[PDB]
Amino acid sequence: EVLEVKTGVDAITEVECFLNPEMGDPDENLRGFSLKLSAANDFSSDSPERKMLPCYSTARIPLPNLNELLMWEAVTVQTEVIGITSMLNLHAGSQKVHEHGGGKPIQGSNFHFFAVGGEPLEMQGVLMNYRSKYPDGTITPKNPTAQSQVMNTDHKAYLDKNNAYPVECWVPDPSRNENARYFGTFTGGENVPPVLHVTNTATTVLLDEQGVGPLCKADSLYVSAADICGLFTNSSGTQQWRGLARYFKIRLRKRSVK
Amino acid sequence: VEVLEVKTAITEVECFLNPEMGDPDENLRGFSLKLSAANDFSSDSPERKMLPCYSTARIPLPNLNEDLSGNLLMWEAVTVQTEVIGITSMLNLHAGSQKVHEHGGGKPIQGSNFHFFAVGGEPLEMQGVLMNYRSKYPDGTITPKNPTAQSQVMNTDHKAYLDKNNAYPVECWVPDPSRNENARYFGTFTGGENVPPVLHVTNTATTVLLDEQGVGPLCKADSLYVSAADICGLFTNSSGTQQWRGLARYFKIRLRKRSVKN
Amino acid sequence: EVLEVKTGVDAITEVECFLNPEMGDPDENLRGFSLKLSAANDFSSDSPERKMLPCYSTARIPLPNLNEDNLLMWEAVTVQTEVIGITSMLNLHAGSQKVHEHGGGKPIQGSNFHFFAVGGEPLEMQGVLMNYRSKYPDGTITPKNPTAQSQVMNTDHKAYLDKNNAYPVECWVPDPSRNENARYFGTFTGGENVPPVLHVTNTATTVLLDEQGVGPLCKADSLYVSAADICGLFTNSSGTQQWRGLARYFKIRLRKRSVKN
Amino acid sequence: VEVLEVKTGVDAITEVECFLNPEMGDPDENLRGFSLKLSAANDFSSDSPERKMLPCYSTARIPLPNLNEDLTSGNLLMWEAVTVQTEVIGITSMLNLHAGSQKVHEHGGGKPIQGSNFHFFAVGGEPLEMQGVLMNYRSKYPDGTITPKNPTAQSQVMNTDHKAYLDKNNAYPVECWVPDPSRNENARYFGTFTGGENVPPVLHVTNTATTVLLDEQGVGPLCKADSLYVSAADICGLFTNSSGTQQWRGLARYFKIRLRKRSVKN
Amino acid sequence: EVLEVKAITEVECFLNPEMGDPDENLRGFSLKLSAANDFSSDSPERKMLPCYSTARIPLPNLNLLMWEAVTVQTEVIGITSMLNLHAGSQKVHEHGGGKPIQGSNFHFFAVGGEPLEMQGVLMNYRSKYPDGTITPKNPTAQSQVMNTDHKAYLDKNNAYPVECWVPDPSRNENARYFGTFTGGENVPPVLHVTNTATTVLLDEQGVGPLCKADSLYVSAADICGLFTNSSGTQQWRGLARYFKIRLRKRSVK
Ligand SMILES: [Cl-]
Ligand SMILES: [Cl-]
Ligand SMILES: [Cl-]
Ligand SMILES: [Cl-]
Ligand SMILES: [Cl-]
């Protein structure tokens, strides 16, 4: 049902935004961090506190109104993580690596994820432990079974609320997202080094094999992210997730559709 | 089979294929039994629930032939989009895992991993290789028959079809590069105690299944076979015991109709 | 606004420079090093010394003024850039902590950041802090009136890289929302044991042209180079750690471009 | 080894398939694919490694169909190796952490195979040409190995005396020899060495990857006296026994080589 | 000025490493590493200091025609020698095998029509270098960053310590160079061999290094990592580098 790209004056636009991370924000002073991790809980008695759980970030961007078809088509995205050099602060609150040494860098398990779509990101739920008791204010797989630990097709959600869908509960659903592009990399392990690139010269092309990008339903663009950079280690040895915001610059064109 | 032109017609099929890590009880779906070792190659009797197995599913397709004469039509697998499902579940460092140190978070899943998928017009063809030819494998497993010391390198007697779900242990079998004329397979083994899992998800990645002559796997008996193994690494309990953790694999296969000579 | 490339005799020029690192320079013998790192300062009492904070390096390169009174502008088309002295890290005999009894010195290793930019105006920078309550020392330029939101994205923290050895690397990143008139490239690798990995070759050129074939255009006849090359931490025999930095070379090809006024 | 005439005629294709066994030392009948436990000399002056402790290059010569009815003709035909598909066989066998392995910690699983590894193959129309290089020129190598003759301290860097054909299976120690880049005009070789005690093995399998054997002029290895030469070394790393002893583990390598008939001057 | 391409020739060289060679039996190794307690008392011994390798390769005299270097094939020689874990090795644990060569490494080559141009940079300007080494003259604290005084030609084999000198990106108009440094005590060596890999030496204008006084210069440094003795002492290990260079005749005026 996709016809010609529409050219003419005002047939192209670009939108930009910064999406803040949602790492748990355990107090008024620790925006961008989670609560300290509390660990070794039997699978039968696993009740994570809300502020310990990083969640997916999401925002809707309104686009100039079109007449109902003409739709905005997302063609490219430029994206990077904002503030990566903040991790060179080894003087603030971090455990000394040895006597007389500097602080321990942020490191360990990390996840870097973004999506651009013409509708909210479609998610599939998978749990480490289907018996986890998730706290009020989170949205997690509803009424999970043992099969929820591998693949349970009942756990479908839209990423339709910021700071609500825990990263550990949800992945982008590859059986859906017909009208979105998503990219993520998970790296797990205690000593994993964060590796992050910035440049204003890199572009991701969002067109499929037929040269069609995401088409923006009701003239709205949806951006999604999760940038868990790794764990911060306090002098006590406690560990907290650290997250950073993500920048998006999306170029769109008008597309004719039936 | 003499392959003629593409019939201009197209369908997509999809499958979420569950991993078969052993499933030691009703609550540990996706995990193996704790890993336990024989002191010796001569007394090596692994329990069934400790052995991850290859996953496989048969996707039935409709017959395309009005007449069972001359030229026939077969379904041809052209592309696959595939992804491991639930990679973010490893960000749960609060459930059951050993502290990395006092007052620290849980130990991440890490260690030896294997990520493998195949798409074929017939069951995956496999070649047996053993770490230890004297391993005594348990009832419910299908493992190399009458193994010899040569079974630890290459014994051409060990040929099998991946013809049963949750029966062929990953440690005993590999895709056979000498066969699989009618399938495409892809795997990476990463070995070691502290190996970081590195997993990517994107709906922009497509594997083309066409060979040098532009022919994909042909569904000879109107069935398509998807095969997987996704051992993500070892989960370490508070106690120090270790268990394999596996994740489901999604498949989306584009098929077209291919004319062939009767 | 942007028109024809002025093609002709005298229409091209190459400029080169070596930009020194600004790692803190704690005394005149330790040029290229920071002061030893402090640690475990509660977030509420974190007052880093100036000499402990590596800063962005920057130079303004004046170009011939092509305008008496349509205008002509210098356009940056390519850059060749290299970190200088990477082999110095093979010196494991100067003041190293031994890796064990009878063993060699501990190499420089750990968190590193390799960054450069070429632009026709100062680099546009965005402030982000590990700890908004950090009290930065005199002679540094850091986010003004920071809040908890400064630990994520706070759009108040916009600055020009307009002073050498003033903008701490830990406080500032290139702003992806600006820098229309510059090209920047950085990689951050974090961790205690990260191996430095550095390449040299005189066969690598970066094209600075955007999609419409236009390079950075030198406003007020100035070319701006910027860098940060934190190689990792040097560990003394005492066990103290210090940032080590190296200089960065730039060779930029420029051409004359016609623009409208 | 299977030699299949895929096509007859001027556009004849022959596919040669084979599985080359590793030669890790095989210290007893039950430990096929392993070396003898590694033992280190105190120093360079009394370094006498045991035969079964030294992995060796694998090689085989595959005879091909005769092409030339008239040995008298102005032109003769040679088999030309155009492509190879290759992979290491049994990589998943390293997921066996239950057999004979050292616990990683109390109550933990077995230690995986890991550490220094070398993955190498060659396809040629004559034996692989090798150059000798030694860690320690004063090593006394055991009966059954072929190692550099009358080595000097210059043998620890480059000694042009140490030239050899890989002309015997399970005889040329991997630690003594490398492919010679000054020769091998009629072979293609590929190898990666990764050193260190915690190095993770990383091995890929696919039936979709083809290496093209043609040079810049579009010419593959030419099989002299109707002979195709395969060579390999696949040291996966070290297996650690419950005792703490370490042995090399090796795996077999599959080859599928596609050959065509090339006319050359008699 | 470079005119038309005029036929072809090939030269090859096995260039030995210069790791220090602390005695007649330890060719390809350095002296054991020692550390000064302090930057003010840093006097390394000559045999402890790996140096750049170089060789001048004489070319057929012509006649202006000049030899132009078009492609190079290069390979580090003897990488499998590191599978010897039986010779003088420290055990990784009780009953375990020997500790492999690992740690900081540098792999570098250059092909030019004249000697390689170098820039000096020091970790420690106050280092006192020994007789037989050529190191930056009148070093200052600026020698730890960029000091434009420190220019040299790689004109002597086994004289210019790797730790004092880099290729000069502001010069070398008539050479191509390539180097990777990987730092850290547990870095694994990763080395590839193949006779299918060629580096083209032509610039964007199609011109390769032109050989002055009918001479070709090859330069290398191949520090593979540290060898650990059973005592726990550590020595650099180096390996030879092969070069095969294809050259064509070029008319100058
Ligand atoms: Cl749900
Ligand atoms: Cl069997
Ligand atoms: Cl500000
Ligand atoms: Cl010899
Ligand atoms: Cl000098």
Side-chain angles (χ1 to χ4, degrees), chain A residues 1-3 5 7-35 37-66 70-95 97-98 100-141 143-208 210-250 252-257, chain B residues 1-6 8-25 27-33 35-38 40-48 50-65 67 70-98 100-144 146-163 165-180 182-211 213-219 221-253 255-260 262, chain C residues 1-3 5 8 11-13 15-67 70-97 99-100 102-134 136-143 145-162 164-179 181-210 213-252 254-259 261, chain D residues 1 3-4 6 9-28 30-41 43-51 53-68 70-72 74-102 104-105 107-139 141-148 150-215 218-260 262-264 266, chain E residues 5 7-23 25-31 33-36 38-60 62-63 65-90 92-93 95-127 129-136 138-155 157-172 174-203 206-211 213-245 247-248 250-251:
Chain A
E1 39 160 84
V2 178
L3 303 175
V5 171
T7 70
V9 276
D10 201 37
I12 292 150
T13 197
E14 88 173 20
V15 288
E16 62 165 21
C17 68
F18 293 90
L19 202 53
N20 273 320
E22 296 301 347
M23 296 297 111
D25 301 335
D27 71 35
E28 65 178 336
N29 292 318
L30 295 179
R31 186 58 167 145
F33 297 76
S34 76
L35 194 77
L37 275 54
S38 67
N41 305 231
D42 189 79
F43 270 24
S44 65
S45 60
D46 175 36
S47 299
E49 292 206 77
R50 184 168 179 200
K51 288 165 171 199
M52 204 187 67
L53 297 176
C55 294
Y56 282 97
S57 297
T58 201
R60 188 183 65 86
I61 304 167
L63 306 166
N65 301 73
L66 302 187
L70 287 184
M71 305 177 80
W72 294 109
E73 178 191 5
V75 177
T76 67
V77 61
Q78 300 190 244
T79 189
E80 68 194 34
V81 173
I82 311 308
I84 63 180
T85 58
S86 69
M87 292 197 269
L88 295 163
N89 188 333
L90 299 182
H91 52 86
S94 59
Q95 187 179 75
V97 297
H98 50 54
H100 308 126
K104 193 158 184 209
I106 285 164
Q107 63 183 46
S109 295
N110 72 53
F111 184 61
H112 292 290
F113 175 78
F114 78 90
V116 177
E119 73 201 54
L121 186 64
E122 293 184 285
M123 322 273 263
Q124 167 67 60
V126 180
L127 303 170
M128 183 54 37
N129 169 25
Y130 87 98
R131 290 177 282 149
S132 291
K133 307 183 235 282
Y134 289 102
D136 293 342
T138 66
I139 305 181
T140 74
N143 306 324
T145 69
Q147 179 73 6
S148 305
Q149 273 169 199
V150 294
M151 246 305 304
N152 184 342
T153 46
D154 298 345
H155 304 317
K156 304 309 194 167
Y158 299 97
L159 178 51
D160 57 15
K161 195 179 179 200
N162 187 66
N163 192 26
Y165 292 85
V167 181
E168 73 170 56
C169 298
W170 299 103
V171 296
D173 186 354
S175 70
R176 297 182 185 191
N177 289 300
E178 297 81 353
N179 197 39
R181 307 300 182 257
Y182 67 78
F183 312 79
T185 300
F186 175 78
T187 315
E190 343 185 6
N191 301 303
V192 163
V195 176
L196 294 166
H197 304 296
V198 291
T199 175
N200 65 338
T201 69
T203 309
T204 298
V205 181
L206 293 170
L207 309 179
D208 65 18
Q210 286 73 67
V212 189
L215 295 174
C216 292
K217 285 170 173 170
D219 303 323
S220 309
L221 182 61
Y222 298 78
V223 295
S224 305
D227 293 289
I228 304 162
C229 291
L231 286 169
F232 184 89
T233 307
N234 301 111
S235 25
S236 66
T238 55
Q239 303 181 299
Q240 300 169 273
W241 300 120
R242 177 61 163 127
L244 289 175
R246 177 175 284 275
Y247 173 76
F248 296 78
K249 176 153 68 191
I250 304 141
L252 304 102
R253 66 185 177 195
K254 289 173 193 185
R255 180 66 82 142
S256 172
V257 329
Chain B
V1 57
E2 190 190 349
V3 173
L4 305 170
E5 75 280 3
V6 170
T8 70
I10 297 93
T11 74
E12 289 188 335
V13 298
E14 76 182 353
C15 180
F16 286 95
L17 190 57
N18 280 132
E20 299 299 345
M21 298 295 109
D23 299 336
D25 72 27
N27 295 330
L28 286 175
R29 185 74 162 117
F31 292 83
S32 69
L33 188 75
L35 267 59
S36 300
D40 206 284
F41 277 20
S42 66
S43 52
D44 179 30
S45 291
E47 297 181 76
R48 193 186 174 194
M50 200 181 72
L51 293 176
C53 291
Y54 282 100
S55 292
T56 195
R58 178 189 170 274
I59 306 167
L61 301 165
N63 188 272
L64 299 170
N65 299 311
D67 203 304
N71 297 346
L72 298 178
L73 288 172
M74 295 182 175
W75 294 107
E76 170 190 10
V78 185
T79 60
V80 56
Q81 301 184 267
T82 187
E83 172 156 301
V84 177
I85 312 300
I87 67 170
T88 51
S89 74
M90 291 186 279
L91 288 165
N92 180 342
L93 295 187
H94 49 80
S97 56
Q98 190 177 67
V100 287
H101 55 237
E102 201 176 16
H103 313 301
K107 199 165 171 213
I109 292 164
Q110 59 185 59
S112 298
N113 66 67
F114 184 57
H115 290 290
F116 168 83
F117 77 89
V119 180
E122 65 196 61
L124 187 59
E125 288 175 289
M126 294 201 298
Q127 168 66 56
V129 181
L130 298 173
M131 173 76 92
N132 171 27
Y133 89 89
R134 296 175 275 151
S135 289
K136 303 173 153 69
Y137 287 104
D139 293 350
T141 61
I142 304 173
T143 78
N146 295 129
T148 64
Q150 224 51 218
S151 302
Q152 294 171 177
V153 291
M154 245 306 294
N155 184 338
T156 54
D157 293 338
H158 309 319
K159 306 298 201 186
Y161 297 111
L162 179 51
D163 52 21
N165 188 60
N166 190 34
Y168 289 87
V170 181
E171 74 171 54
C172 301
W173 302 104
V174 294
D176 189 352
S178 79
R179 284 180 307 152
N180 290 302
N182 196 32
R184 308 300 185 251
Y185 70 77
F186 309 83
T188 301
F189 177 79
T190 309
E193 338 185 19
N194 298 309
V195 162
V198 173
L199 296 170
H200 306 294
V201 292
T202 180
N203 63 341
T204 63
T206 299
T207 303
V208 174
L209 297 167
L210 302 179
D211 64 14
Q213 286 74 264
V215 188
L218 296 174
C219 305
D222 305 312
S223 48
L224 179 74
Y225 290 81
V226 292
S227 300
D230 291 287
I231 303 168
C232 294
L234 290 164
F235 184 87
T236 308
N237 296 294
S238 316
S239 73
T241 63
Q242 289 181 316
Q243 289 169 280
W244 299 115
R245 176 62 154 114
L247 292 181
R249 179 165 283 273
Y250 177 74
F251 296 80
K252 177 138 58 64
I253 303 152
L255 300 146
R256 64 179 178 202
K257 306 184 181 178
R258 174 68 74 147
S259 166
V260 304
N262 212 326
Chain C
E1 198 218 359
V2 168
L3 304 175
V5 178
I12 306 90
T13 192
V15 296
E16 72 175 6
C17 55
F18 287 92
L19 194 59
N20 278 321
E22 301 298 347
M23 295 298 107
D25 303 339
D27 64 45
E28 291 118 309
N29 285 339
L30 295 186
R31 185 59 166 138
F33 297 76
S34 75
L35 191 71
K36 75 173 221 138
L37 273 59
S38 68
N41 317 31
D42 198 79
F43 273 25
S44 54
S45 55
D46 171 46
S47 302
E49 302 214 67
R50 190 181 174 184
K51 287 162 169 195
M52 200 184 64
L53 297 178
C55 291
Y56 284 92
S57 308
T58 193
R60 185 167 67 73
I61 304 163
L63 306 183
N65 31 321
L66 307 177
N67 304 294
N70 270 15
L71 300 185
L72 292 164
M73 289 191 88
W74 287 111
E75 180 191 1
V77 299
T78 66
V79 55
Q80 293 197 71
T81 186
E82 181 153 300
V83 179
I84 308 300
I86 70 168
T87 53
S88 62
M89 288 188 278
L90 289 163
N91 180 338
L92 300 185
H93 56 81
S96 41
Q97 186 178 73
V99 296
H100 50 70
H102 308 121
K106 199 185 172 64
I108 287 162
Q109 64 177 257
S111 300
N112 67 70
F113 180 61
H114 285 293
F115 171 80
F116 78 90
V118 185
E121 64 193 64
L123 183 70
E124 292 178 280
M125 289 197 314
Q126 168 68 56
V128 180
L129 300 174
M130 177 69 96
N131 165 34
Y132 86 96
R133 286 170 293 156
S134 287
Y136 286 100
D138 296 334
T140 68
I141 309 175
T142 72
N145 195 231
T147 68
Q149 295 305 304
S150 303
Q151 294 169 176
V152 292
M153 253 301 307
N154 180 340
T155 54
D156 282 8
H157 304 321
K158 304 301 187 169
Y160 301 112
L161 181 49
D162 52 18
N164 189 56
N165 195 22
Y167 290 88
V169 185
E170 70 165 60
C171 298
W172 299 108
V173 295
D175 186 351
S177 73
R178 303 187 170 184
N179 289 304
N181 195 33
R183 307 303 186 254
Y184 73 77
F185 315 81
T187 303
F188 172 83
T189 314
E192 7 178 2
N193 294 328
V194 155
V197 174
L198 295 165
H199 309 284
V200 293
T201 179
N202 63 338
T203 67
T205 304
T206 297
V207 177
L208 293 171
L209 306 189
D210 64 16
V214 190
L217 299 169
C218 295
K219 289 180 192 159
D221 304 311
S222 282
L223 179 68
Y224 291 83
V225 292
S226 313
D229 287 290
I230 303 163
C231 290
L233 293 168
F234 178 97
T235 311
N236 293 295
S237 21
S238 59
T240 71
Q241 312 178 289
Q242 290 169 283
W243 295 116
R244 181 66 159 108
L246 292 174
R248 179 172 284 269
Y249 171 76
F250 299 81
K251 183 165 68 174
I252 304 159
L254 302 111
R255 76 194 171 179
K256 286 186 207 166
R257 166 82 70 160
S258 319
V259 304
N261 19 0
Chain D
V1 186
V3 183
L4 167 62
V6 159
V10 63
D11 65 336
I13 293 290
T14 293
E15 282 194 6
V16 174
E17 275 199 334
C18 65
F19 283 95
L20 200 57
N21 286 312
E23 298 296 351
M24 296 295 110
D26 297 345
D28 77 39
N30 285 343
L31 294 169
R32 180 67 160 127
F34 298 77
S35 75
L36 192 71
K37 78 184 198 65
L38 271 65
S39 296
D43 59 72
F44 277 24
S45 50
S46 68
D47 174 37
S48 302
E50 296 221 82
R51 166 71 155 130
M53 197 187 67
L54 297 175
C56 285
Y57 285 91
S58 302
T59 192
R61 180 181 75 84
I62 304 164
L64 305 168
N66 196 305
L67 291 171
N68 309 282
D70 189 89
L71 294 167
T72 274
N75 303 132
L76 289 184
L77 288 173
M78 295 177 82
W79 288 115
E80 173 185 12
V82 169
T83 60
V84 59
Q85 298 186 276
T86 187
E87 72 191 24
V88 178
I89 310 306
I91 70 179
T92 61
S93 67
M94 296 191 267
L95 291 167
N96 183 338
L97 298 189
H98 48 85
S101 210
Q102 189 177 59
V104 287
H105 53 247
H107 309 122
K111 197 185 195 195
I113 287 166
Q114 62 186 45
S116 307
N117 67 67
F118 184 56
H119 288 288
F120 170 85
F121 77 96
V123 176
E126 64 200 56
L128 187 73
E129 295 173 291
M130 301 203 90
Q131 170 72 46
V133 183
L134 308 170
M135 180 67 96
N136 168 28
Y137 86 95
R138 290 172 289 150
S139 289
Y141 284 103
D143 262 6
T145 66
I146 305 170
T147 78
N150 297 131
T152 67
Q154 289 303 130
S155 293
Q156 295 171 174
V157 296
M158 248 307 294
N159 182 334
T160 63
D161 283 353
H162 309 326
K163 307 303 212 179
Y165 287 25
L166 183 49
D167 64 1
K168 190 165 193 204
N169 186 60
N170 192 30
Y172 293 84
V174 179
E175 74 169 56
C176 296
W177 300 98
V178 296
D180 183 354
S182 68
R183 305 182 174 195
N184 289 303
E185 315 292 318
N186 193 38
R188 309 297 182 255
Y189 70 76
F190 312 79
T192 301
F193 172 83
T194 307
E197 68 263 34
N198 299 311
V199 158
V202 181
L203 297 170
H204 309 290
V205 293
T206 183
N207 60 343
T208 74
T210 300
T211 298
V212 172
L213 294 176
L214 307 179
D215 64 14
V219 190
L222 294 179
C223 296
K224 288 183 179 165
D226 297 337
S227 301
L228 172 57
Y229 294 82
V230 292
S231 311
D234 290 291
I235 303 162
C236 292
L238 290 171
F239 176 93
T240 305
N241 298 279
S242 23
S243 65
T245 60
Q246 294 191 311
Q247 296 162 278
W248 299 116
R249 177 60 154 138
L251 294 172
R253 176 172 287 273
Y254 176 74
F255 297 80
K256 173 154 60 209
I257 300 161
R258 279 192 38 269
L259 300 100
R260 67 177 175 203
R262 188 178 277 256
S263 173
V264 310
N266 198 349
Chain E
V5 160
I8 291 150
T9 207
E10 290 204 336
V11 300
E12 69 182 1
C13 167
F14 284 103
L15 188 63
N16 280 310
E18 304 293 354
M19 295 297 112
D21 296 350
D23 69 40
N25 290 335
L26 291 175
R27 175 66 164 143
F29 301 75
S30 79
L31 191 71
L33 272 50
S34 294
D38 198 86
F39 277 26
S40 61
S41 59
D42 179 30
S43 301
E45 299 187 49
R46 182 148 180 220
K47 287 165 185 337
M48 198 182 76
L49 293 175
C51 291
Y52 286 91
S53 301
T54 196
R56 191 179 69 77
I57 305 190
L59 296 170
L62 309 176
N63 305 138
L65 288 176
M66 296 183 100
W67 287 116
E68 186 192 2
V70 177
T71 69
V72 55
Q73 298 196 267
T74 184
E75 179 154 304
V76 177
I77 305 305
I79 65 183
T80 57
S81 77
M82 290 187 274
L83 288 161
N84 180 340
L85 301 185
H86 52 83
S89 44
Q90 185 189 68
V92 287
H93 55 240
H95 314 309
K99 188 178 195 191
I101 288 166
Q102 54 186 266
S104 307
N105 69 68
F106 183 55
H107 294 285
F108 169 84
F109 75 97
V111 179
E114 60 208 55
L116 189 63
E117 298 179 277
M118 329 272 273
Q119 165 72 45
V121 184
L122 300 173
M123 174 62 34
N124 169 31
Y125 87 94
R126 288 176 282 148
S127 285
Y129 285 102
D131 290 345
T133 68
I134 308 169
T135 71
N138 288 294
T140 70
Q142 302 302 305
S143 307
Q144 299 175 170
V145 287
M146 250 298 299
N147 177 339
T148 53
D149 287 2
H150 304 321
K151 302 307 196 178
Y153 303 102
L154 181 53
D155 50 22
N157 191 62
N158 188 29
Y160 290 90
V162 183
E163 74 170 51
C164 299
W165 304 99
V166 293
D168 188 352
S170 69
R171 300 193 178 176
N172 286 301
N174 192 42
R176 309 299 183 259
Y177 68 77
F178 316 79
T180 301
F181 174 86
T182 310
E185 65 266 28
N186 302 314
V187 165
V190 177
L191 298 160
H192 308 292
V193 290
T194 181
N195 55 350
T196 70
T198 300
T199 297
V200 173
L201 293 172
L202 307 188
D203 61 20
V207 183
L210 303 171
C211 303
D214 292 320
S215 277
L216 179 64
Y217 294 75
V218 296
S219 317
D222 290 291
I223 298 156
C224 291
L226 289 168
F227 179 88
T228 312
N229 301 104
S230 25
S231 54
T233 61
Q234 299 190 304
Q235 302 171 268
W236 299 114
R237 181 64 162 116
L239 292 177
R241 180 176 283 275
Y242 176 75
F243 302 73
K244 189 162 84 193
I245 307 162
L247 308 105
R248 61 185 184 196
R250 175 68 80 134
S251 35

